Amino acid sequence: QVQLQQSGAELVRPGASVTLSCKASGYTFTDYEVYWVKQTPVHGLEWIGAIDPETGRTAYNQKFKGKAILTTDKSSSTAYMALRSLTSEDSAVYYCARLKSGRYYGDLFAYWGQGTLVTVS
Amino acid sequence: QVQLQQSGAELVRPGASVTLSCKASGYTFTDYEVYWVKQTPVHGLEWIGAIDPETGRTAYNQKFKGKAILTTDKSSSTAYMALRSLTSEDSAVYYCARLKSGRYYGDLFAYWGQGTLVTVS
Amino acid sequence: QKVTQAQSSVSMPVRKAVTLNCLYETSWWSYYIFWYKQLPSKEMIFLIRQGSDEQNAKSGRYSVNFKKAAKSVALTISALQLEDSAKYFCALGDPGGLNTDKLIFGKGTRVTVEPRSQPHTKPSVFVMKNGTNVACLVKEFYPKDIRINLVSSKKITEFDPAIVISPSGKYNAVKLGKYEDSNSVTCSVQHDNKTVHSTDFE
Amino acid sequence: QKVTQAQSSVSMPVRKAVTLNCLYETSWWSYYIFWYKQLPSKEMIFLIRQGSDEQNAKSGRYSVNFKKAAKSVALTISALQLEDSAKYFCALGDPGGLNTDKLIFGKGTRVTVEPRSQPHTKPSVFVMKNGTNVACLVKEFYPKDIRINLVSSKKITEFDPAIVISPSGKYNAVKLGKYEDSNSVTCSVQHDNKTVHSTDFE
Amino acid sequence: QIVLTQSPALMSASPGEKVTMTCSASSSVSYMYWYQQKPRSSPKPWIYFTSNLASGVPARFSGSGSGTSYSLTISSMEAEDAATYYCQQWSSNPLTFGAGTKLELK
Amino acid sequence: QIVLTQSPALMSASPGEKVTMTCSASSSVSYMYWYQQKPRSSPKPWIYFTSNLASGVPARFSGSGSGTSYSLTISSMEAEDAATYYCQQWSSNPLTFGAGTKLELK
Amino acid sequence: GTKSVTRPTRSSAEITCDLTVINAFYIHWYLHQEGKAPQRLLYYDVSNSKDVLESGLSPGKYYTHTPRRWSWILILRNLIENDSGVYYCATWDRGNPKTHYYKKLFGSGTTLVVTDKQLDADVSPKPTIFLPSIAETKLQKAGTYLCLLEKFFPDVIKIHWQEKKSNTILGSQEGNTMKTNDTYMKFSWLTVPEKSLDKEHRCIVRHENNKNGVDQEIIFPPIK
Amino acid sequence: GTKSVTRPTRSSAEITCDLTVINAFYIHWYLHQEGKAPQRLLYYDVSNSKDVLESGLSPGKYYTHTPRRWSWILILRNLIENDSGVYYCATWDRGNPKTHYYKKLFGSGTTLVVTDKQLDADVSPKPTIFLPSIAETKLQKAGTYLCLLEKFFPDVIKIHWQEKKSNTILGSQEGNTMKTNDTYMKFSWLTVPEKSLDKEHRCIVRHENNKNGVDQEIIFPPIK
Numbered sequence A, B: 001q002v003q004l005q006q007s008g009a010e011l012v013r014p015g016a017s018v019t020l021s022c023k024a025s026g027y028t029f030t031d032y033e034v035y036w037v038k039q040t041p042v043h044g045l046e047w048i049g050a051i052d053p054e055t056g057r058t059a060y061n062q063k064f065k066g067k068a069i070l071t072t073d074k075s076s077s078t079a080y081m082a083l084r085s086l087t088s089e090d091s092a093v094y095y096c097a098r099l100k101s102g103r104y105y106g107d108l109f110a111y112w113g114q115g116t117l118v119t120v121s
Numbered sequence C, D: 001q002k003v004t005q006a007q008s009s010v011s012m013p014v015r016k017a018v019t020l021n022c023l024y025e026t027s028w029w030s031y032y033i034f035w036y037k038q039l040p041s042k043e044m045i046f047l048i049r050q051g052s053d054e055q056n057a058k059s060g061r062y063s064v065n066f067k068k069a070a071k072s073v074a075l076t077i078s079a080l081q082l083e084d085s086a087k088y089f090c091a092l093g094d095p096g097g098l099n100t101d102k103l104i105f106g107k108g109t110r111v112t113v114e115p116r117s118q119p120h121t122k123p124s125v126f127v128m129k130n131g132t133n134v135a136c137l138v139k140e141f142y143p144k145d146i147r148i149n150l151v152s153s154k155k156i157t158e159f160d161p162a163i164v165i166s167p168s169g170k171y172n173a174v175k176l177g178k179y180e181d182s183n184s185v186t187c188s189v190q191h192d193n194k195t196v197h198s199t200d201f202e
Numbered sequence E, F: 001q002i003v004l005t006q007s008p009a010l011m012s013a014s015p016g017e018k019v020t021m022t023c024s025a026s027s028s029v030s031y032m033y034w035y036q037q038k039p040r041s042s043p044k045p046w047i048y049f050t051s052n053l054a055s056g057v058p059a060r061f062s063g064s065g066s067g068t069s070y071s072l073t074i075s076s077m078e079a080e081d082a083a084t085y086y087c088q089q090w091s092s093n094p095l096t097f098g099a100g101t102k103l104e105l106k
Numbered sequence G, H: 001g002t003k004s005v006t007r008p009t010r011s012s013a014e015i016t017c018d019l020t021v022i023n024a025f026y027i028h029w030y031l032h033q034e035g036k037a038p039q040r041l042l043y044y045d046v047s048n049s050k051d052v053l054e055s056g057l058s059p060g061k062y063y064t065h066t067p068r069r070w071s072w073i074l075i076l077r078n079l080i081e082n083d084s085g086v087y088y089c090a091t092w093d094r095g096n097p098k099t100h101y102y103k104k105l106f107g108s109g110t111t112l113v114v115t116d117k118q119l120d121a122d123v124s125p126k127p128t129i130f131l132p133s134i135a136e137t138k139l140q141k142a143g144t145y146l147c148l149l150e151k152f153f154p155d156v157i158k159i160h161w162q163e164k165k166s167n168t169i170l171g172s173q174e175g176n177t178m179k180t181n182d183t184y185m186k187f188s189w190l191t192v193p194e195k196s197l198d199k200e201h202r203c204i205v206r207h208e209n210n211k212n213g214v215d216q217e218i219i220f221p222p223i224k
């Protein structure tokens, strides 16, 4: 079965670069891309990144551009996102997302990770 | 033979309208037009008018336009020119002119009148 | 730049000369005047050209009277034939030095030629039929006014007589019809002082 | 507004699926991607269309993998026939709502198909002549590397062998020549492990 | 960028009642997707097209609406603290979800 | 309007001498015409084209010149107080003659 | 002769140029209408391919095409009424130094007629020949053959007569083209002497919208 | 098939459209060159007669003509090198509501080749047929007829085989078109079984610059 596993919650300093990992199992990582979404109680949830493992092309939100850079590894089948300047109210849950195989459900995010909580001082 | 006869010299007042006549004999008046030239010792001689008896179309010099108006009569075969404001140094000889029959001599004035002298006070 | 010919039409016999006037206005200092002929079968034939500067140009039966100051050009045709039934156009040719200069044509004059010989002849009438179509032919008649007619009780259609000039110099006219009957139709043409039917000439 | 396909050519056997990539950049919010086929006889055949919004569209043997965020379109052909030797073009169709929208094509990919069956066969050679023109035909041979040659003292011209695929699945090759002599010319084709002349097969 | 505003901030639906939640959009959106979330879990896929069902949801859920102001309807409530939280559209390059609608069972 | 200037204001030609009179033009003129005048008489037609003779003049008269600065030449003088007085051109709409050249017999 | 094109309204029309010039630089196009003077529309260059049209004309309506090395065709994009008339191909002649550009050679002129949705009633000359009358009284029964072209929409038509040989044109005196309610009618008649009455006589009609698109040739059988 | 036009430099060229559409509103023209992507040149409207060309192209070079009710022709005014290539006629399909404008139908494409002063060496396919070899050892002397088109300048050529009847296309496997110093050479060969060897075989070559301007039909006589 398709499954995505994410790293646990990490306590972070006001200024640092944090790498969040997401590993996909049950399907071929090369064909499908991984979206990254951030959910916060005040702003809700918004799409913050998208990375295609096959070619490495990345799409960012305009507000989140520059803040987050994503990388992928097909051998380990894991996607990492880097975060900086985390003290600026960036304490939120981070979710992976993947569309249904063959895009059956349109643009709906069929498969989600369990979510990693990031809290900053 | 082609001949043109003109009126004699006339003494004139400083302000008056003077009519100078020119009668053509020896050819058909309707076909050919009559040119009118003024010769003065200071300015030489210049073309001052041209009238076509057949249709009455008239061509004037720009400087002499308005000053002189020409009329023709085919029944009498005579062309008249009217002059006004004659006191302004307009004491000169007036000649009729006609091109050679069939325009053989180009634009040359083949047939001339004897000339009428106009002197003003 | 503007050309006018006020003569709508002119009619002259064969041996009488005709003149055609052309009055133009132009701001060009040196120019040319061209005369063109438009036959009833549309075609432009160059007759003569008169330069504004050179002398009067005569070619064949066509002569030109040129008035530079009055800006008038007249074309005279002397002893015109029967083929001079065409339209005549006067074109103020712009200075032809360039290959791009146009010709400013004017509303042309129409020349019609009447026959010269004037003998008197008695027309001969005939009736020729195909199916329900009947044509009455009147041949070798000088008097233009014939008022040719046909006799028939039933009148389906009728067409105006066509009168043209025979090469002998006389007139030939033809009528038509779509009358219901064929045998009973008989023509009749009125001479300038008499009248003849189709009962004779048979 | 820009489309690229970096694959110059791809070669696959009959029963193996092939994939063709198309990477594009566009500022249009909603658009379509069209796939077209250009046969060796120039003609554009519409294969498939993928809308930016709808799901993955599958038609026949052609499937499309669509990546909206990465903006990538891949065409997969499964169990391709021998007629899939044409060029494949990816066109970023502008929103087709209007009748005036163009298609932004890209440098297409070339697909070549190799035969599936792999038996070993011995070629058969023949020599056929007309006048001074000689053609050596080698028929029913699987090994691509033949290096077919002809023997002749005098060499006028020579043309590269033409090797194509027989409908039986094997290869057929033909050579030509303009040799001076006709009777003495003899062909010879090298099998993948042997060699045969035209002295036999006669 | 479309705000994807949602009219109902909160509801007090009870079993035996059919309720509707509207998700208005500033600009017209072709298709509309919905997500359901539950406490201590990631949002579920749920609806995948206008008036569609996905991932095996109860038949009570349904969708409707024109190109603007899509909606969702449920016929009966049965022990679900949140029938449908969030929206989603990708007609615009910035894919935005919305504030979310929460309806407490009463 | 072309001024049609004439270089020689006066000449003192004598019999047995061939003289030339030039009639320069400010602008180029295609053809050039000349007139001869005598006291108590109208100007005679005389020349009618460049290098031409008209109205029965002595053969001694002749013309020459390019499109600008035409001239006239006479071979011998014989009891003529004025061989050729005036010029004329009609290449321009204002037809102008010129001052005139007078040559007293000496 | 004179050709004709009868393309309907809102449809491109093509007019050929009958001039035979091997070194033409500019080719001018003139338009002549009934009761109005001919006026130039445009002129197309040869050394360079652009064409220049006079003021007052919308750009793109007139185009010039050269299918061959020397064959100019004027193409009208969209046709409306008032665009009818005779189109003439013109070009300046030789002799620039002497007899300076003596003529502007004009073409035979193509008549353009713009109608609405065509006639659609099989408009083509429908002859109805007449037999000579009994006329042994005068002209030894020379007779007068008649070629009566009945119903044809385009105005232009060329009727001329011939014997079994086509070397010499027979002299036939035309009638007139009357305007029947929706068509045009014309007729020709010819008198042939008895010395040549033994020959069959062909009436040749040249006309656009003609069946097979060729010059129709009606045959009058000979009578001794 | 695919046609071709080989008009020389500095001469207008005409390309026809093979589309059969009865309600087209816009007709687009595409250009494809070797090693480059197809790019639209212009599109001509039908409801109104003006045509719109893309930026970067000089106005007046491309024109659209409609000789018939539905027959579009693209005319290039002045030809220079780099203007060669395949020209495609394109138009949007039906089904706007569902399967929204599913296809952009493309024409067969006309190849335009621009040369200098033509070849002038009678460039036309010059066949040289080959007789079957003695092959009674294998395939019961099936043989292989050869159609060897020798010297022709334009690249495009369509060789296909037929029997005395033209109903069914015979399967003939082509060679290749080598580039001789100034021309192109191609050849076809066909194997026919003995059961049908009794029939004469026609090799049909479709080619521009062909004598009589028709599809040449070389005949191989039958052998029992």
Ligand SMILES: *[C@@H]1O[C@H](CO)[C@@H](O[C@@H]2O[C@H](CO)[C@@H](O[C@@H]3O[C@H](CO)[C@@H](O)[C@H](O)[C@@H]3O)[C@H](O)[C@H]2NC(C)=O)[C@H](O)[C@H]1NC(C)=O
Residues within 6 Å of the ligand: C130, C131, G127, G128, G129, G130, G131, G221
């Ligand atoms: C009245 O005029 C009509 C219309 O021209 C005549 O009919 C035409 O007659 C000619 C012979 O005189 C026919 O030509 C020949 O007819 C047949 C059938 O085609 C054949 O021998 C030849 O191929 C040739 O065409 C002509 O076809 C015919 N036209 C029609 C429309 O029927 C008619 O004969 C005239 N009546 C009299 C009494 O002269």
Ligand SMILES: *[C@@H]1O[C@H](CO)[C@@H](O[C@@H]2O[C@H](CO)[C@@H](O[C@@H]3O[C@H](CO)[C@@H](O)[C@H](O)[C@@H]3O)[C@H](O)[C@H]2NC(C)=O)[C@H](O)[C@H]1NC(C)=O
Residues within 6 Å of the ligand: C156, G180, G181, G182
């Ligand atoms: C042009 O076409 C019109 C169409 O209305 C023609 O009108 C025609 O009028 C006549 C009566 O004047 C109708 O009857 C016809 O009368 C005579 C005999 O009396 C004859 O032509 C026919 O046998 C017919 O009976 C005729 O039906 C009618 N045509 C129609 C309705 O199509 C008009 O005469 C024509 N003009 C011409 C030919 O100059």
Ligand SMILES: *[C@@H]1O[C@H](CO)[C@@H](O[C@@H]2O[C@H](CO)[C@@H](O[C@@H]3O[C@H](CO)[C@@H](O)[C@H](O)[C@@H]3O)[C@H](O)[C@H]2NC(C)=O)[C@H](O)[C@H]1NC(C)=O
Residues within 6 Å of the ligand: D130, D131, H127, H128, H129, H130, H131, H221
């Ligand atoms: C070698 O190839 C040449 C080129 O094709 C062959 O010449 C061609 O032979 C065929 C018959 O096999 C000729 O067709 C017929 O020829 C005559 C004369 O025209 C006549 O019966 C028919 O009208 C028909 O055309 C063909 O014309 C001829 N071609 C030329 C250019 O001469 C030649 O026969 C071949 N040699 C052998 C030994 O097969």
Ligand SMILES: *[C@@H]1O[C@H](CO)[C@@H](O[C@@H]2O[C@H](CO)[C@@H](O[C@@H]3O[C@H](CO)[C@@H](O)[C@H](O)[C@@H]3O)[C@H](O)[C@H]2NC(C)=O)[C@H](O)[C@H]1NC(C)=O
Residues within 6 Å of the ligand: D156, H180, H181, H182
């Ligand atoms: C394309 O045309 C050129 C034109 O120069 C051809 O050059 C040709 O060169 C050969 C020598 O290489 C000259 O002699 C020829 O040689 C062989 C036999 O040795 C044979 O082809 C001929 O019988 C001839 O003797 C030949 O004259 C010359 N051609 C000329 C000057 O027109 C070149 O070979 C051609 N390229 C091809 C066909 O691929």
